[PDB]
Design a protein around this motif. Structure first.
Motif, PDB file in Angstrom:
ATOM      1  N   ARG D   1       0.803  -1.220   0.000  1.00  0.00           N
ATOM      2  CA  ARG D   1       0.000   0.000   0.000  1.00  0.00           C
ATOM      3  C   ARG D   1       0.833   1.267   0.000  1.00  0.00           C
ATOM      4  N   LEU D   2       1.894   1.292   0.784  1.00  0.00           N
ATOM      5  CA  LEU D   2       2.709   2.487   0.886  1.00  0.00           C
ATOM      6  C   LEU D   2       3.449   2.734  -0.413  1.00  0.00           C
ATOM      7  N   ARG D   3       3.865   1.681  -1.093  1.00  0.00           N
ATOM      8  CA  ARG D   3       4.510   1.844  -2.379  1.00  0.00           C
ATOM      9  C   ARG D   3       3.514   2.415  -3.358  1.00  0.00           C
ATOM     10  N   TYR D   4       2.297   1.910  -3.340  1.00  0.00           N
ATOM     11  CA  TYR D   4       1.313   2.500  -4.216  1.00  0.00           C
ATOM     12  C   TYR D   4       1.192   3.976  -3.914  1.00  0.00           C
ATOM     13  N   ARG D   5       1.114   4.361  -2.652  1.00  0.00           N
ATOM     14  CA  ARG D   5       0.911   5.773  -2.342  1.00  0.00           C
ATOM     15  C   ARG D   5       2.090   6.601  -2.819  1.00  0.00           C
ATOM     16  N   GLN D   6       3.294   6.089  -2.643  1.00  0.00           N
ATOM     17  CA  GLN D   6       4.483   6.788  -3.082  1.00  0.00           C
ATOM     18  C   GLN D   6       4.435   7.007  -4.583  1.00  0.00           C
ATOM     19  N   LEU D   7       4.108   5.972  -5.343  1.00  0.00           N
ATOM     20  CA  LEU D   7       4.011   6.116  -6.788  1.00  0.00           C
ATOM     21  C   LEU D   7       2.893   7.075  -7.216  1.00  0.00           C
ATOM     22  N   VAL D   8       1.794   7.104  -6.485  1.00  0.00           N
ATOM     23  CA  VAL D   8       0.711   8.012  -6.815  1.00  0.00           C
ATOM     24  C   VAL D   8       1.144   9.434  -6.584  1.00  0.00           C
ATOM     25  N   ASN D   9       2.000   9.651  -5.604  1.00  0.00           N
ATOM     26  CA  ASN D   9       2.500  10.992  -5.366  1.00  0.00           C
ATOM     27  C   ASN D   9       3.985  11.097  -5.683  1.00  0.00           C
ATOM     28  N   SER D  10       4.332  11.218  -6.960  1.00  0.00           N
ATOM     29  CA  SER D  10       5.733  11.396  -7.346  1.00  0.00           C
ATOM     30  C   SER D  10       5.824  12.051  -8.715  1.00  0.00           C
TER      31      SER D  10
END
Ligand SMILES: Nc1ncnc2c1ncn2[C@@H]1O[C@H](COP(=O)(O)OP(=O)(O)O)[C@@H](O)[C@H]1O
Ligand SMILES: N[C@H](CCC(=O)OP(=O)(O)O)C(=O)O
Lengths: 15, 267, 15, 17
Positions: D1-10
């Motif tokens: 989940r955190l990786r998804y969030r990081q990719l969504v905000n980059s």
């Protein structure tokens, strides 16, 4: 870079 | 004047498009939660609740657009992007909205069942009785139906939109009230933007009908559906969908909204 | 705009 | 989940690096 520009966000998710 | 509250048992409530979706096309969490809680507490009291919801198209746009952006090349995310097919949206938004309603009502100890009827199948004769039988059985079982027009599969001069669905449904079900929950807090003598209008308590023809401005819908269809729903029984009330307590004070005999009553000449 | 595109984030491409 | 969030905000460029 060409890859990063002809690729789909989902693709970035997969290594 | 509003004295039928001592009798009302079967109620039909419609939630429009600007009551379910807030900003960006997502759900209006607080509004929907409050309306669902009030419907649940109404169901517990003993009233029979009929729900005709709307707003699946917006949810549609949202999820479908997202998926678009998800699977689209970064550079390609700048070039013209097709518009999501209306029918395609409906097929996603109806599922999303029904799942959300099911989760809220399961959290509120009320059971709901999906019931999709297309508006062009209503000229059939067997359906005219099958709908009345099925709704009667499910209401006797204390289950709240959620009617909606089937947009995923379907086929202007005539507007048989959600308002018409609710009106003719309450005509079929022989209900008592057809509450129209909308963004505005009732009828108005013109647009609500300016300050040269007034909230209308009761709807009499030869005082307000051909004297006010009527404007996928709009009040030009709201009024035309409400008049037909009113003549044939089933007085209707139009009230603001924003207020969480609106249903309770409407059903407690208080003076909230606009009445379209067939015997309104007395009042 | 491509310059802007490169700067934005998938999140921003939306909205 | 955190990786998804990081990719969504980059930033795209960030995605490159
Ligand atoms: N008296 C009036 N005359 C013309 N337009 C009105 C009047 N009162 C309200 N309106 C506008 O018409 C719109 C009708 O919305 P409504 O049909 O209730 O929900 P939706 O169109 O989202 O299903 C409101 O947003 C309101 O701004
Ligand atoms: N499914 C949606 C329901 C929303 C709706 O009908 O609202 P209305 O057009 O009566 O103001 C549609 O058919 O446009």
């Amino acid at each position: 870079y060409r890859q990063l520009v002809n690729s789909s966000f989902a693709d970035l998710q997969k290594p």
